[PDB]
């Protein structure tokens, strides 16, 4: 059994900013590789962000490149997104998940094996 | 999915030259490497390695360097080839004991002047040991004189067994065995890797071996084969026992020119009485100690065995008895009064001093050992024992020695050099 | 943290990090002789390592990663037992036999790899 | 034009310019022994010093621009000082005392940057 | 196939495949002394050899390709000739003459270049 929780502000003004955040619990944090991925309000899934085990290496879609700064501190098992400038196109669920990468010196995921409940974030 | 690391902590068995370090001697002088104040040594945690100390080259080097240091210590000194002279010799006979009586020779001879056209009656004093009677009842010869040159050894170098530290070079690691109760052969956990060896003393012995270390909590006893009764069986004390030694007569020097810028040290006329050397070991000690060693001998030879403890077998000096260099000085004691019991105040051991040497088991190369000036008083730690089997419901243990790599075995049994290698490969889930 | 040595009997994924620690320790007329013959072995061995990694196209790095394929018959393990069971000296001894010919690959694929780069240019 | 040291009065941009030039002056048995001290030594010397580059990732460069910020309080100087007014003598004399800080830091962004790049591949 | 200097006799496009091989192949006092002599240096030529390929930037590559033009004076001959024709020893011969200038014109353009290389960073 392994736990993601998500927690962070779901209300913000565009133009604005908003960091979220994910603990994590029963597993090696510090093991795996981890992602954001959005759930529109009414539609599906899509990939954000993903960040290296030892937090080193990080990859966003174009969407939010310029925009979003993903980060790990595995002395605390979190992760965070820190958001800057918002658009009304930014309203979703955020899923924290473990996954996506992958270590080089170990079997390869390219899938994500958690899922946590996600944050919700509204732009106004 | 090839990919290549350099720097993998691997390494194999080898055997490469090591180098001396060290904090007038024979041996380490300034030929040797200053040591490192805080030297360092690493645990290995989860290592398991195969030590075998009967196979261990760093004994073979011990015993070259220190050979190789003590003939070059005295290549240049004097050359005594005026000295093997015919000898008139008669007794002393001047407040003599009974033990004494016989032991020395009072030898006059015609020794060389500094001028090629004059001659010197002079004499000296010689144990019997080291001269020949030949033919007339009153000539002798040294003991020497038919098989090789003798030198002097030069009476500024001393003999002090100065620690000496082995350390590896450059590629190359040094480890050692922490394991307590290690006998010398097998795998052994607790594994450290060190830069060099802690000081070894060059302590040169027959039969007891004095000043070493101590077995960490139980007597020990190793063998290449102990149910072979060619091999020795040493054994490490974890305790000391202590031998003090003299030479209880205040002997004099004299110098004898004997060439343009040579001299012989000869031994003068000898203050007060004439008294037999000898060593005491403590009784109670010994018994104690000898206690232990059977114990543990019963753990490969039956608890219901007979274990006795003999003297040593017929031989030469250096052999039969214990040998050893203290103050200057070379004491052939006779341990028969330790060695002779059945299972298991001090006890006095009568010893026989020689100033002609032999040393090692070479034959060609002679010293004379100059005279020492006063009274010579030791005082020493037994660590030790190389005993001999002698062999159905009993087993007879005698004191053995003569082979020097026996005395270095004992001290260099915890340390194994190995090689390093640092390349290796292994399947990665990468593509350049 | 660890010194010389200190990851030996660690497992080849925690080990593999220490590799600087190990690289660096690698560097009376008779004794002058034989410690001159020590120091002088000492880098001809350094050398030939080197010499070797550059021919694979590996000059400058600790940890090299090639274009040369895994045969199973060398090792068939995945790369979670041998990154997180085995030590760096279990593994030398398990492909012993294979070091020569993988070593033999190495060289090959850099020399075409360096023909290739010559003739894109 | 100047040969060997002739810009140790140089400022440290004039000099740098030149380091070709002290790059390449790098390189009776008893009077045999001591002459291949000497000739051991310089090889040992000069090879400490690339592996050390080597570890660093400078392998094969004069001049090597790394991955590591500088701490003020190493040297609290702007660069027209450092490399306008300043010679290499004086400058070595200044941060003497945080070379081996500066080392550390070095190989330490270096292996981070060597596994980074394999987790890439 | 060939092994040491086995391409000797061959042409240069030809040979200029076995670079590794002659890479691989360069590696009672009195007597010692001696072989001491010998083995230094070996060490001491291979380094020379090494040092001045990392100046010109050419450091762990068997084959590098430069920024320096050829100029006709130096060798008014086609690609054709050069590598068809000719053997090494045959090209060593015939410009001996401009061995030196060549490498004076390689290590400038390497200066220049490590210098363009840290101004664009
Ligand atoms: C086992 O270890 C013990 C402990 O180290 C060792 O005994 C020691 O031996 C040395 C040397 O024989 C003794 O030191 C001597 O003490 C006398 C005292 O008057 C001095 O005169 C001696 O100096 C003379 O020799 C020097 C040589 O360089 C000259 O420079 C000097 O001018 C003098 O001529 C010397 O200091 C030391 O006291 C004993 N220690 C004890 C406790 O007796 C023992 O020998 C070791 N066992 C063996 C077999 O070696
Ligand atoms: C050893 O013999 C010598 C003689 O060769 C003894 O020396 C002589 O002793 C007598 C005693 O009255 C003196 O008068 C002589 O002058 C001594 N001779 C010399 C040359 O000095 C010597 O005492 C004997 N030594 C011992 C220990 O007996
Ligand atoms: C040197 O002389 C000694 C003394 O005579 C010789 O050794 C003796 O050899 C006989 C032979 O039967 C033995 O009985 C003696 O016991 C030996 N004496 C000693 C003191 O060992 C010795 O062999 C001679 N050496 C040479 C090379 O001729
Ligand atoms: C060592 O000392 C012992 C006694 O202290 C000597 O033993 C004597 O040896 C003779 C030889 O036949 C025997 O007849 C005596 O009975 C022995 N005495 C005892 C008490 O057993 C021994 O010879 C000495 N050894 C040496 C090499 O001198
Ligand atoms: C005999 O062995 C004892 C015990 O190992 C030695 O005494 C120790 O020497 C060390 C040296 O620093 C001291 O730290 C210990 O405290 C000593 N122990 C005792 C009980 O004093 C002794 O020196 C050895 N004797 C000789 C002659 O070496
Ligand atoms: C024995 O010692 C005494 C002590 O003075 C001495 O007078 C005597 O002459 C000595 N004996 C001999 C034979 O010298
Ligand atoms: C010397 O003492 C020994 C002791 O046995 C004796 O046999 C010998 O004859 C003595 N020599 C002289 C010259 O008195
Ligand atoms: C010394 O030489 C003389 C010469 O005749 C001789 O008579 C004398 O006995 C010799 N001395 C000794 C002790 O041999
Ligand atoms: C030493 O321990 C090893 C461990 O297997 C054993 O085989 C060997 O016989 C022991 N040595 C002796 C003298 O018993
Ligand atoms: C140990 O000695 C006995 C004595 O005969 C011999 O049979 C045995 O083979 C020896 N052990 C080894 C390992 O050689
Ligand atoms: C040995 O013990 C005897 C007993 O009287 C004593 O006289 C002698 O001095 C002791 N020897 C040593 C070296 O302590
Ligand atoms: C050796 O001499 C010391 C000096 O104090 C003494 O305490 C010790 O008991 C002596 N040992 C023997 C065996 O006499
Ligand atoms: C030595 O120990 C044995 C054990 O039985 C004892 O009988 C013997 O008397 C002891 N010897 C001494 C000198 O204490
Ligand atoms: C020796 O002591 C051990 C201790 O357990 C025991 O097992 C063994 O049978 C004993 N041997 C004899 C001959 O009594
Ligand atoms: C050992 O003791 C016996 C007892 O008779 C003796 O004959 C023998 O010579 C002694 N061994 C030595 C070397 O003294
Ligand atoms: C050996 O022990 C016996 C027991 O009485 C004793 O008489 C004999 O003298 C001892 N031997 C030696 C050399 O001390
Ligand atoms: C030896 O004799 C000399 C003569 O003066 C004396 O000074 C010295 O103290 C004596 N030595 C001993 C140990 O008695
Ligand atoms: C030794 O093995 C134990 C077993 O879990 C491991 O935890 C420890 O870290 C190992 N030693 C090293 C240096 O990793
Ligand atoms: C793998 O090795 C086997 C022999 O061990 C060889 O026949 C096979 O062709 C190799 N596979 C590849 C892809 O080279
Ligand atoms: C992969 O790892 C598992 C461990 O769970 C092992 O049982 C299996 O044999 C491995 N696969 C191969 C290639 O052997
Ligand atoms: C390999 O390491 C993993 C790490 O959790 C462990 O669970 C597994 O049992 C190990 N396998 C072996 C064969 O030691
Ligand atoms: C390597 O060769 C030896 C030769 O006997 C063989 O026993 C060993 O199994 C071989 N290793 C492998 C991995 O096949
Ligand atoms: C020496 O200092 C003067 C001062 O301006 C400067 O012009 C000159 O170029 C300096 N020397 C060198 C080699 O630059
Ligand atoms: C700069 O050095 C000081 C100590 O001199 C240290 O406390 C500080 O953290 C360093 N700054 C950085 C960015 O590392
Ligand atoms: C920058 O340079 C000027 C020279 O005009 C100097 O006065 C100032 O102190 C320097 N800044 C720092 C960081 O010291
Ligand atoms: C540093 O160099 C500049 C170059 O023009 C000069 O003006 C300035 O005075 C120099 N400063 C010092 C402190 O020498
Ligand atoms: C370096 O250490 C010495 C030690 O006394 C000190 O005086 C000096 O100022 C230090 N250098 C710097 C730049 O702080
Ligand atoms: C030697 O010359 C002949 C001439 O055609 C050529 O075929 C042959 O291959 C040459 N040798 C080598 C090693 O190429
Ligand atoms: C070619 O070499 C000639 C002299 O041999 C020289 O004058 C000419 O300038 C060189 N050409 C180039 C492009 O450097
Ligand atoms: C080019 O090659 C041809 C060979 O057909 C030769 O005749 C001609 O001279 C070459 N050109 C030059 C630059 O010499
Ligand atoms: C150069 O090689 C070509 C290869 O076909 C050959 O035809 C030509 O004749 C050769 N030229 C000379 C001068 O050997
Ligand atoms: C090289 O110099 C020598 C000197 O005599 C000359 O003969 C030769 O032709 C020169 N080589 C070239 C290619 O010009």
């Known amino acids: 059994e392994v736990q993601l929780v998500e927690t962070g502000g779901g209300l913000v003004q565009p133009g604005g900013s908003l960091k979220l955040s994910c603990r994590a619990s029963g597993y090696t944090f510090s093991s795996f590789a981890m992602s954001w991925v959005r759930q529109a309000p009414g539609k599906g899934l899509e990939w954000v962000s993903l960040?290296?085990?030892?937090?080193?290496?990080?990859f966003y879609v174009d969407s939010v490149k310029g925009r979003f700064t993903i980060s790990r501190d595995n002395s605390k098992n979190t992760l965070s997104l820190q958001m800057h400038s918002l658009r009304d196109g930014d309203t979703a669920v955020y899923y924290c998940?473990?996954?996506?990468?992958?270590?080089?010196?170990?079997?390869?995921?390219?899938?994500?094996?958690?899922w946590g409940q996600g944050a919700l974030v509204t732009v106004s | 999915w090839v990919t290549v690391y350099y720097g993998v902590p691997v390494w194999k068995d080898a055997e490469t030259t090591l180098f001396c370090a060290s904090d007038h001697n024979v041996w380490a002088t300034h030929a040797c490497v200053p040591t490192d104040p805080n030297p360092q040594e690493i645990h290995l945690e989860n290592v398991t390695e195969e030590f075998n100390m009967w196979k261990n080259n760093m004994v073979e080097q011990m015993h070259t360097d220190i050979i190789s240091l003590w003939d070059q210590s005295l290549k240049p000194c004097v050359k005594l080839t005026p000295l093997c002279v015919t000898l008139q010799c008669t007794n002393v006979t001047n407040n003599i004991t009974d033990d004494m009586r016989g032991e020395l020779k009072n030898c006059s001879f015609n020794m060389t002047t500094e001028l090629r056209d004059k001659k010197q009656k002079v004499y000296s004093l010689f144990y019997r040991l080291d001269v020949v009677q030949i033919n007339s009842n009153k000539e002798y010869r040294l003991i020497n004189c038919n098989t090789s040159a003798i030198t002097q050894a030069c009476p500024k170098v001393s003999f002090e067994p100065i620690p000496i530290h082995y350390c590896a070079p450059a590629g190359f690691a040094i480890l050692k065995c922490k394991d307590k109760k290690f006998n010398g052969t097998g795998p052994c956990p607790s594994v450290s890797t060190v830069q060099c060896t802690h000081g070894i003393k060059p302590v040169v012995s027959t039969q007891l071996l004095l000043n070493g270390s101590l077995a960490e909590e139980e007597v020990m006893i190793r063998s290449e084969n102990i149910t072979n009764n060619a091999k020795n069986i040493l054994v490490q004390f974890n305790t000391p026992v202590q031998i003090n030694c003299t030479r209880p007569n205040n002997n004099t020097r004299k110098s004898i020119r004997i060439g343009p810028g040579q001299a012989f040290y000869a031994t003068g006329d000898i203050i007060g009485d004439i008294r037999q050397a000898h060593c005491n070991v403590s009784k109670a000690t010994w018994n104690e100690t000898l206690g232990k060693v059977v114990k543990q001998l019963r753990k490969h030879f039956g608890n219901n065995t007979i274990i006795r403890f003999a003297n040593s077998s017929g031989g030469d000096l250096e052999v039969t008895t214990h040998s050893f260099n203290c103050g200057g000085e070379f004491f052939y004691c006779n341990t028969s009064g330790l060695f002779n019991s059945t299972w298991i105040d001090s006890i006095t051991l009568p010893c026989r001093i020689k100033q002609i040497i032999n040393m090692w088991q070479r034959i060609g190369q002679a010293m004379y050992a100059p005279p020492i000036q006063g009274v010579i008083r030791c005082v020493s730690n037994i660590t030790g024992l190389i005993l001999t089997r002698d062999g159905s419901t009993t087993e007879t243990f005698r004191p053995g020695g003569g082979d020097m790599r026996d005395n270095w075995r004992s001290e260099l049994y915890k340390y194994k050099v190995v090689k390093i290698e640092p390349l290796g490969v292994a399947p990665t889930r990468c593509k350049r | 943290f660890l010194g010389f040595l200190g990851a030996a009997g660690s497992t080849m994924g925690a080990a593999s990090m220490t590799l600087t620690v190990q690289a660096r320790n690698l560097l009376l007329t008779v004794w002058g002789i034989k410690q001159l013959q020590a120091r002088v072995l000492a880098v001809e061995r350094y050398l030939r390592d080197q010499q070797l990694l550059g021919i694979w196209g590996c000059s400058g790095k600790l940890i090299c990663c090639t274009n040369v394929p895994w045969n199973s018959s060398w090792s068939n393990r995945n790369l979670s037992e041998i990154w997180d069971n085995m030590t760096w000296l279990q593994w030398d001894k398990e492909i012993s036999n294979y070091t020569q010919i993988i070593y033999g690959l190495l060289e090959e694929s850099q020399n075409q790899q360096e023909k290739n780069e010559q003739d894109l240019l | 034009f100047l040969g060997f040291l002739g810009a140790a009065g140089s400022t440290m941009g004039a000099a740098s310019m030149t380091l070709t030039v002290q790059a390449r002056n790098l390189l009776l048995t008893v009077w045999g022994i001591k002459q291949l001290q000497a000739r051991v030594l310089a090889v040992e010397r000069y090879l400490r010093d690339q592996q050390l580059l080597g570890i660093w990732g400078c392998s094969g460069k004069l001049i090597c621009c790394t991955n590591v910020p500088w701490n003020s309080s190493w040297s609290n100087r702007n660069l027209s000082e450092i490399w306008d007014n300043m010679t290499w003598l004086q400058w070595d004399k200044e941060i003497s005392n945080y070379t081996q800080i500066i080392y550390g830091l070095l190989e330490e962004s270096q292996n981070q940057q060597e596994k980074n790049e394999q987790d890439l591949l | 196939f060939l092994g040491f200097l086995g391409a000797a006799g061959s042409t240069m496009g030809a040979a200029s495949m076995t670079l590794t091989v002659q890479a691989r192949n360069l590696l009672l006092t009195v007597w010692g002394i001696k072989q001491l002599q010998a083995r230094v240096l070996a060490v001491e030529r291979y380094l020379r050899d090494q040092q001045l390929l990392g100046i010109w930037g050419c450091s762990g590559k068997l084959i590098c390709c430069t920024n320096v033009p050829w100029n006709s004076s130096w060798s008014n001959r086609n690609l054709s000739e050069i590598w068809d024709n000719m053997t090494w020893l045959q090209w060593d011969k015939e410009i001996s003459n401009y061995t030196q200038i060549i490498y004076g014109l390689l290590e400038e353009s390497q200066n220049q270049q490590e210098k363009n290389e840290q101004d664009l960073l």
């Open positions: 960040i290296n085990d030892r937090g080193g290496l990080t």
């Open positions: 998940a473990t996954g996506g990468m992958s270590s080089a010196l170990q079997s390869s995921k390219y899938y994500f094996d958690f």
